[PDB]
Ligand SMILES: NC(=O)c1ccc[n+]([C@@H]2O[C@H](COP(=O)([O-])OP(=O)(O)OC[C@H]3O[C@@H](n4cnc5c(N)ncnc54)[C@H](OP(=O)(O)O)[C@@H]3O)[C@@H](O)[C@H]2O)c1
């Protein structure tokens with residue numbers, strides 16, 4: 001299987017990347033250094049993760065060390081919800097660029113369709129804990145994203161956690177200048193996303209699967225929660241192919257023509273997780289994994305469920 005997928009901006013995106021949500025700032029520099037050493041060329045970042053400076057130290061050292069060239073790296077970051085106003089988007093991008101010590105991003109995503117009130121708080125709340133929305137709408141934010149392409153700050157723009165109606169809204173935006181290149185969404189055998197993925201692919205939008213391992217370190221994990229890594233049915237498929245469960249869970253989206261971004265700060269796992277290009281799941285394996293769907297989401301916050309733009313009321 002090829003290692004990159006062609007985007008609708010003409011650039012190629014590595015289909016395996018390293019996630020960095022929850023990667024501790026004191027561990028993620030070494031994690032990214034190790035990742036590049038063992039072959040990763042795509043790093044998934046975000047301002048809200050509060051570790052972009054430390055990710056950048058790693059990227060810069062490996063560029064200076066001549067382990068890799070910048071053109072060979074695919075660095076993604078995301079515009080946080082409190083910066084959807086037109087006048088705040090460039091600054092938000094430039095802070096990400098300064099922290100990552102880059103002069104462009106390969107891909108910048110609108111992190112969520114929901115805009116929040118600007119200010120220092122990433123999740124501004126009212127007295128009863130509802131997030132405070134902003135009045136910006138997604139189409140003006142999108143035009144601000146298009147400006148970043150035209151200023152050379154980013155090579156591609158896209159979206160994340162957009163539902164099909166929301167993707168459609170961007171695609172039908174009056175005066176649309178650049179189509180989203182990517183929609184990054186939660187996707188794994190308990191949330192298989194067939195409808196949203198086929199819609200996006202039919203429009204030439206590449207889908208990135210996040211939390212492919214079910215995010216076992218998410219802060220709100222509950223006993224009763226399903227566990228991909230521990231699911232005996234998936235362990236069995238892994239056993240059959242002489243791979244680990246995680247390797248199965250990473251290969252699965254790759255064979256759906258998705259990009260996948262498993263997170264780890266554990267060197268042995270970082271290496272393990274990249275060793276997924278030398279085996280194939282069968283069609284039957286794939287259909288079996290798809291059958292485990294239960295519409296289970298890692299990422300869906302109660303505090304945002306009344307925002308007008310909350311993406312997960314619609315089926316997809
Ligand atoms: N667009 C958005 O809204 C959004 C939302 C969620 C996630 N994402 C992106 O997606 C990335 C991946 O999602 P995620 O961080 O939620 O979780 P994930 O990649 O599904 O799972 C990460 C967890 O799995 C562990 N793990 C990694 N490799 C393993 C292996 N081979 N064997 C056993 N355990 C392993 C990691 O542990 P150690 O780190 O301790 O090894 C960590 O606890 C994020 O980091 C972020 O970059 C984007």
Ligand SMILES: O=C(O)CCCc1nc(-c2cccc([N+](=O)[O-])c2)no1
Nearest residue numbers: 021112114298299300301304310311
């Ligand atoms: O940004 C990441 O990579 C994941 C951080 C964890 C996470 N964020 C959210 C979150 C943030 C903003 C909006 C929503 N919403 O449901 O409308 C959910 N739910 O879960």
